Amino acid sequence: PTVTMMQVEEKPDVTYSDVGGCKEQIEKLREVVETPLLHPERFVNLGIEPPKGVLLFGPPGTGKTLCARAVANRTDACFIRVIGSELVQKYVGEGARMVRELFEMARTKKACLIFFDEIDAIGGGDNEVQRTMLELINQLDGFDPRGNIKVLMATNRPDTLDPALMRPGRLDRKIEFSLPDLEGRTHIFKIHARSMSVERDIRFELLARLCPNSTGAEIRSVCTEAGMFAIRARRKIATEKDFLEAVNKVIKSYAKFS
Amino acid sequence: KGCLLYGPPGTGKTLLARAVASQLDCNFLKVVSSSIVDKYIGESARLIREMFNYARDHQPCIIFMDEIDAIGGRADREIQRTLMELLNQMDGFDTLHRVKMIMATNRPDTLDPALLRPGRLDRKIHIDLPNEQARLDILKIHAGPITKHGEIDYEAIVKLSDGFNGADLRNVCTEAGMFAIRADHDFVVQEDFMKAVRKVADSKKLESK
Amino acid sequence: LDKQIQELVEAIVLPMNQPPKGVLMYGPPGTGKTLLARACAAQTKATFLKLAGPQLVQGDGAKLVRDAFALAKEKAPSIIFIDELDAIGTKAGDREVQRTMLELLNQLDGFQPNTQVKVIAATNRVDILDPALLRSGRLDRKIEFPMPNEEARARIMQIHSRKMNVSPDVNYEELARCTDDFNGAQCKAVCVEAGMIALRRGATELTHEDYMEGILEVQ
């Protein structure tokens, strides 16, 4: 149906160095998306049951940016990102054929990688959801589609009990959000220097040290009010003295209650 | 429409009610005392009306009640509520006909003298202790359908059985027959009877509470 | 823990290689009865057909009983391992699962061809137990579990760490002594945790100090 040709995702997007400051965790989740892609036989010959992928949970923060990074680091054929809102729908019975036809497309596309977004929508009456998650794990643990390509869960709450007790068998490499230190934000600054006319007088270390506890969501809002108040001020160039009030406003006025 | 089987000295009601209930019983439906503790909200009233409602919708019906001594306190508020449903549904205005219920207990002291009233419990039979001679005769009339080897000796089985349960006597003796049938021998020697009857019977002394 | 794995391996292998029909695998928690019966399945080599407790609750439990006994009727002699039977057999849905239960006992009572594939039952507690389960065809093998020791933890961790590339220098006494107040799945966190950094260490073969480095790493 429309989900077949619509599901295939093209037009690549945000890259590697937009990571929210993780130096070791970016290797802990990079050595399963980039290293197995360079050769299949390598991790097959590395022993028994090569790792499928990683696990992302906790606070949203810089979410959906590292998955866009995984889409960007695709070297040969642009990959896909299954969304969670398509499995739980009205008129049950189409989610099974949906996951079996997208896993069948994974079989057809020479060991294609699959990513699962918003697992909390199908995680955790709920018998129509138990079909999608019990049949979903029944197809992941099954050796029919593939057992080496990719697993990656990106969600907000790890409060899904059944996937938490079914995950240690097949899923592996769970990591936290790993909030950055003071020096981590300047990488996101150096890569987002394509933003709305960052002047060369703007120092990225000054902007980094002027905002503590400012994980990728809060500096992404620094960029949101940066370009937004750059458009609303009828200006065309951005100067740190022109939007520092928007910076400390967007971090302090939004850091008071939250 | 009511009867009581209290056997405080000894036992033997399980072989009777399981012998006839296993023979015909005219039906099959067991109600255990653990379906009433109701750890959640105490809505067991509609469970009594629903389950007994099906027990009256079905014309043939016989209900057993085992281990009522702990749920027969003279937590107890919902117990006495279901006992008010037992009064109003044993001697009430309902369809209280042929359908029959049977109560079993252990001690004749906390037996809810409101339930000990006639109607709620018409008959009562005081079971006695299983005598060594009664154990020998019950083991001879229960030794019929089970196969044994030509070498037989009931003196060790009856002698080594002191203060045991008759239901546990039959289930432990037949448990020893099933212990000796593991090696698919048509003949059953009494060596495995001494072994499995002794060990499993001592396990029923550990679990004889 | 050897006489009960011998009693279980006999209970499910002497009919596989009157034979026993039912087995009640219970005991206190912390042992790993599901992975002990699955470790037994690793020795039987037959197909391991998993089934959970609340899978009967979806008049469908009788359909899963007749389905497991249809696969038992025609399907090759696999190993059906059900678990958490006391939670669904609570002695109006629970009464429907009691009808499923009495149909299960009726099919394990009135059927002579029951010498085929068996069903292994596991419970975490025997407080809720059907008194009508006293039959050769029904659940017969009632085994209690003792407290495991560090030697038995080295046994199950050796069955669970026998296929991986482990260096042949393991005294099992440093790691067996360091694993205190642990369980089976936590020793699986130990061995899998030792398998985590096997990629970034570069050495594709597991070493000695990685077990105790996992114990001190996550636990």
Side-chain angles (χ1 to χ4, degrees), chain B residues 18 28-30 32-36 47 50-51 54 171 175 178 181-182 184-185, chain C residues 7 10 14 18-20 90-92 95 98 102 128 131-132 134-136 140-141:
Chain B
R18 192 175 69 188
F28 194 75
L29 65 153
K30 178 66 173 66
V32 186
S33 66
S34 66
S35 178
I36 308 99
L47 183 62
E50 186 175 1
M51 180 181 71
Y54 295 162
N171 293 121
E175 182 67 28
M178 295 180 285
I181 207 166
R182 295 171 64 185
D184 64 23
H185 286 89
Chain C
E7 187 71 25
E10 283 181 352
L14 88 89
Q18 295 295 321
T90 300
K91 61 182 176 65
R95 188 186 64 81
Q98 287 178 358
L102 297 182
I128 304 299
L134 295 169
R135 190 179 182 271
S136 178
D140 196 2
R141 302 294 185 92

Side-chain angles (χ1 to χ4, degrees), chain C residues 52-155:
Chain C
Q55 293 298 110
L56 296 182
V57 178
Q58 296 295 321
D60 292 329
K63 183 177 71 176
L64 272 75
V65 168
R66 298 180 65 89
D67 196 3
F69 292 160
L71 271 72
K73 181 67 176 176
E74 182 181 1
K75 183 61 66 68
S78 65
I79 301 299
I80 289 93
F81 173 73
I82 68 170
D83 194 359
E84 287 93 9
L85 187 64
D86 57 352
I88 57 174
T90 300
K91 61 182 176 65
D94 290 332
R95 188 186 64 81
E96 293 179 353
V97 193
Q98 287 178 358
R99 184 182 67 188
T100 300
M101 181 176 69
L102 297 182
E103 185 168 357
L104 177 72
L105 273 70
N106 197 1
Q107 290 179 355
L108 269 67
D109 196 2
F111 284 169
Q112 55 182 357
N114 209 166
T115 62
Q116 209 169 3
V117 190
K118 282 83 184 172
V119 171
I120 302 169
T123 59
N124 288 318
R125 190 173 178 180
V126 293
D127 57 352
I128 304 299
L129 184 62
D130 195 2
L133 286 168
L134 295 169
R135 190 179 182 271
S136 178
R138 295 172 182 174
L139 296 175
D140 196 2
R141 302 294 185 92
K142 293 186 285 185
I143 305 167
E144 199 269 334
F145 287 167
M147 290 295 106
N149 207 4
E150 61 258 8
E151 288 85 4
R153 289 192 292 270
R155 291 178 186 269

Side-chain angles (χ1 to χ4, degrees), chain A residues 5 13 72 101 165 214 236:
Chain A
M5 63 179 289
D13 49 1
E101 79 184 1
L165 58 94
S214 293
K236 270 74 177 176

Side-chain angles (χ1 to χ4, degrees), chain C residues 179-196:
Chain C
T179 52
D180 293 331
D181 293 331
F182 289 167
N183 290 318
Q186 295 180 356
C187 295
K188 291 177 70 68
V190 169
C191 182
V192 168
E193 180 63 30
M196 295 298 284

Side-chain angles (χ1 to χ4, degrees), chain A residues 205-221:
Chain A
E205 61 182 1
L206 183 71
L207 185 63
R209 68 186 179 181
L210 259 63
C211 58
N213 297 114
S214 293
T215 63
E218 191 164 357
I219 55 172
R220 190 170 67 190
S221 66

